[PDB]
Design a protein around this nucleic acid. Structure first.
Lengths: 68, 66
DNA sequence: CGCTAATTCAATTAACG
DNA sequence: CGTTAATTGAATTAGCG
């Protein structure tokens, strides 16, 4: 099935991915405040940061052996 | 420490959201981007509003199925 | 084709008045 | 406490070297 017109796929920079990953290592579920400070520091929207964390947890769960 | 924050919509914001819901239950990105300007909300809050509004609507159909 | 960003859902949690 | 906005995993869609 084909979905309706969607937002253009965001291409992140080397800096952005490295910066987001540092926060992911501290916590997989950052509060709104943590995400907003990452959104300003990386010049991203709080929305793109929240979707990145949603997908980063999905990638981590797939590779993970343990229950958590 | 409040982990998440909450958006309290104005009556005008709700009129403009419900207007687009009655035209299209699944607005495209171009349609959502317009509401973001019209209602001063982010496109992100329009997605979230629309998915709760859809969930809310499907519950009605399940109750009035016979 | 692999990786991953974006968008749906059902179930559930938590902010606000 | 009631209302409902926000968040989550899971599934899925799809852009793009």
């Amino acid at each position: 099935n084909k979905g309706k017109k969607r937002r253009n796929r965001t291409t992140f920079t080397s800096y952005q991915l490295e910066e987001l990953e540092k926060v992911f290592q501290k916590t997989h579920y950052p509060d709104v405040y943590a995400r907003e400070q990452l959104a300003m520091r990386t010049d991203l929207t709080e929305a793109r940061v929240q979707v990145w964390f949603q997908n980063r947890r999905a990638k981590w769960r797939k590779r993970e052996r343990w229950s958590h």
